[PDB]
Amino acid sequence: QTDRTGETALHLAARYSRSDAAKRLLEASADANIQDNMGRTPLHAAVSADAQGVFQILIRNRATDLDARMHDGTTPLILAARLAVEGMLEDLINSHADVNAVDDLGKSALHWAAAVNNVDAAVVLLKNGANKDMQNNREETPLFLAAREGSYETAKVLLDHFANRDITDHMDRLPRDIAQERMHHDIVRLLDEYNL
């Protein structure tokens, strides 16, 4: 711990993308699930830093908690989904990360991916379990966050695996509504008229 950020020698090599620097630190039976003051394991750092090199190491390593949370309870599967990086989401899925794991606001990577209109993510995530109608501690279906943010493409995709468009939020507003409101008439037209 450099005690500035609470970060370990591993954490650093993760963020700095030193892919084999990390390797010897693993030859050393060095724990790869240490938390910095943000409460993130070097894997988190690795994802955050789009460091495919180091990433690959940690996930190929069995010791490493793939579903580790941060102080706000973010999983690497979450960052992976929002920070729009290539591959990572998938690799974590294949290595059997809890796809329905949630952060403190109880949003799943599917949720976030619909927040950041991350269509690719959402599809992969759907085809790997993923509660498509999960709620968060505001009773928000990920179809909802989509319809709020108005991210239409990801939206078509859950409408596509038939997400339930009628599950509301914790204030009895349909997703259909937070559209109307935020003035996304497209997302509306889609909710009014696509599938059923």
Partner: protein, 423 residues
């Protein structure tokens, strides 16, 4: 007049000024339902403060343009939103705070949660936008529940700020809340303060050096309370339940929301803390003959207790009047460092983000990728944006991070990026 993006200049003359406007809604975490024709009011009343040495600047600048004492009058309205009841005005005249003591929630409001929206504008129709409270939970009745922490949301946990009020014999008008006037605790029917409910050890050392604990709060525990308002603290108290003005000493259950109770001052005989039909004092509590460990107690040592919340929002005008509301106001929970050095970025998680912001590192605007409502991303600008010499970060530099709108409204953050030499 077309909208003017804030300038390298306007900024550096805000890091000197810091003449912030700032709203500040206080309010309870729960609200009792109101079945049929009745009307249960929110029993600490949602209390819209209005801090910041810059509201004045806005009265000044306004009138110095041709504006009434009637015009530069901030004009607020509160409301639960989603109703035919319409909204209710607040009298922000004279004093800067205000309270809405006749707010309720019909039987014809199915929603098992809700939010207070505090609409606002200057008299001149000049808009300032809607402000939102931090989520409130309908209940049906104060839930007297033994040790199953199943709902958890209802249990008053340690550390949380709570406000407690006293009403008497069952009459609407008497209501008086433990508030602090300058440094002397009283019971206003206008003002209520919010105190932190820190937990303590059963066995005790001196009355200072206050070391805190974890977990929920159960009746019987020892709990000091520090006011965020004056900073002051009351002597070490012991919370115990109450049934028909009798304070049962052996209550082993956890304090649920909106529960009547009483505060035994530790080591003061059998004295408790009690409401004064005036300025607040202590009381001896009656005998306890037929019921052994169950003391009978006064009208005034019987408080109702509710966990509270605040909803702050700061924002400065950095390019003068702007036609559209300054709202929604960006609030920034956490600031993450993605990557390092020459690639270094920064992810911002908060809420109410909008594509039309741009995070500024001190006076240097940084390119800003908006991911969504509650996440943003920006590129840590090179160190030679501040110290014009150096191609590298030769030693620690710390600038304050801040969000800045298009028409240059600037939402402050009090969060600071700190450059550091590479390890």
């Amino acid at each position: 007049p077309p909208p003017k993006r804030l300038t390298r200049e306007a900024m550096r003359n805000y890091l000197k000024e810091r003449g912030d406007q700032t709203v500040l809604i206080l309010h309870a975490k729960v609200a009792q339902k109101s079945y049929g024709n009745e009307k249960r009011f929110f029993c600490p009343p949602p209390c819209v403060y209005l801090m910041g040495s810059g509201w004045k600047k806005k009265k000044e600048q306004m009138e110095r343009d041709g504006c009434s004492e009637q015009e530069s009058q901030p004009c607020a309205f509160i409301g639960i939103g989603n109703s035919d009841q319409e909204m209710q005005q607040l009298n922000l005249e004279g004093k800067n705070y205000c309270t809405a003591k006749t707010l309720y929630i019909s039987d014809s409001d199915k929603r098992k949660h809700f939010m207070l929206s505090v609409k606002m504008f200057y008299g001149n129709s000049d808009d300032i936008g809607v402000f939102l409270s931090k989520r409130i939970k309908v209940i049906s009745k104060p839930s007297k529940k033994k040790q199953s922490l199943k709902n958890a949301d209802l249990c008053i946990a340690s550390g949380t700020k709570v406000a407690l009020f006293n009403r008497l014999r069952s009459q609407t008008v008497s209501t008086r809340y433990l508030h602090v006037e300058g440094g002397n605790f009283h019971a206003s029917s206008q003002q209520w303060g919010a105190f932190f409910i820190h937990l303590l050890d059963d066995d005790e050392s001196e009355g200072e050096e206050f070391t805190v604990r974890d977990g929920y709060i159960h009746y019987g525990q020892t709990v000091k309370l520090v006011c965020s308002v004056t900073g002051m603290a009351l002597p070490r108290l012991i919370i115990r339940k109450v049934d028909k003005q009798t304070a049962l000493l052996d209550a082993d259950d956890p304090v649920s929301q909106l529960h009547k109770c009483a505060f035994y001052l530790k080591d003061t005989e059998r004295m408790y803390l009690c409401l004064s039909q005036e300025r607040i004092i202590q009381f001896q509590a009656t005998p306890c003959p037929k019921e052994p460990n169950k003391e009978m107690i006064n009208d005034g040592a019987s408080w109702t207790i509710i966990s509270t919340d605040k909803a702050e929002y700061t924002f400065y005008e950095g390019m003068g009047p702007v036609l559209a509301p300054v709202t929604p106001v960006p609030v920034v929970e956490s600031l993450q460092l993605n990557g390092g050095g020459d690639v270094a970025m920064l992810e911002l998680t908060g809420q109410n983000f909008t594509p039309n912001l741009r995070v500024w590192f001190g006076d240097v605007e940084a390119e800003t990728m908006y991911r969504c409502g509650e996440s943003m991303l920006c590129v840590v600008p090179d160190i030679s944006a501040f110290r014009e010499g150096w191609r590298w970060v030769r030693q620690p530099v710390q600038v304050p991070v801040t969000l800045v709108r298009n028409d240059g409204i600037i939402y402050s953050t009090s969060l600071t990026f700190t450059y550091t030499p590479e390890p």
